[PDB]
């Protein structure tokens, strides 16, 4: 029932890049999802204490959220776009794993994921 530490957003010994694809993931993908009317449950780690979800971190062992992704992008945490795309996919998948089909949170994830897929469909060619 307690919260775990959040995912890492800083690691000075992890090698970093700022590729044109990563810039797109920030300027296009994250900004589009962040401003969406359904973004708010995804803008920070799930607070299992405040939300009374004592089993959330029993079931979800790879937590991820847009607040974390935003920090990772703004602090140039990633080497490549695939790492960040995997973070978005982890976020969506966690929601579908934990919750029931048709729950409000699942509908919200599905709306965000539809936009995510549209934006990643036009991920620019590297350099
Ligand atoms: C991804 N996610 C998110 C929420 C969820 C909804 C609303 C609000 C917040 N907030 C606000 C600040 C801290 C916080 O946790 C999380 C949620 C709630 C119930 C069941 C499942 C989920 C879920 O799967």
Residue 30, ligand 1, Cβ within 6 A: no
Q: Enter the tokens of residue 64.
A: 């991820």
Experimental method: X-ray
DSSP annotation string for the chain:
-PPPPPPP---TTS-----HHHHHIIIIIIHHHHTSTT-GGGSS---TTTTT-TTHHHH-SS---HHHHHHHHHTT--SSHHHHHHHHHHHHHHHHHHS-TT-HHHHHHHHHHHHHHHHHTTPPPP-
Residue 81 Cα to ligand 1 middle (Å): 26
Which residue is associated with the tokens 């957003």? 9
> What is the Å distance from ligand 1's center to 27 Cα?
25
Resolution (A): 1.2
Is 122 in contact with 35 (CB distance < 8 Å)?
no
The CA angle 30-112-2, to the nearest 5 degrees, is 85
Scan for tokens 């995912």, then name that residue: 7
Distance 8 CA to ligand 1 centre (A): 20
Which residues are within 8 A (CB) of 92 and not within 5 positions of it... i.e. 6 or more apart?
109, 112, 113, 116
What residues contact 26, with CB distance under 8 A and at least 6 apart? 73, 74
């Amino acid at each position: 029932s307690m919260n775990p530490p959040p995912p890492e957003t800083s690691n000075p010994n992890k090698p970093k890049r700022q590729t044109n694809q990563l810039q797109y993931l920030l300027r296009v993908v994250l900004k589009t999802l962040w401003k969406h009317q359904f973004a708010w449950p995804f803008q920070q780690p799930v607070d299992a204490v405040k939300l009374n979800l004592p089993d959330y971190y029993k079931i979800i062992k790879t937590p991820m959220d847009m607040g974390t992704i935003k920090k990772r992008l703004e602090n140039n945490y990633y080497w490549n776009a695939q790492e960040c795309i995997q973070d978005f996919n982890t976020m969506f998948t966690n929601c579908y794993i934990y919750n029931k089909p048709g729950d409000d949170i699942v509908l919200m994830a599905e709306a965000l994921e539809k936009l995510f897929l549209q934006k990643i469909n036009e991920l620019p060619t590297e350099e």
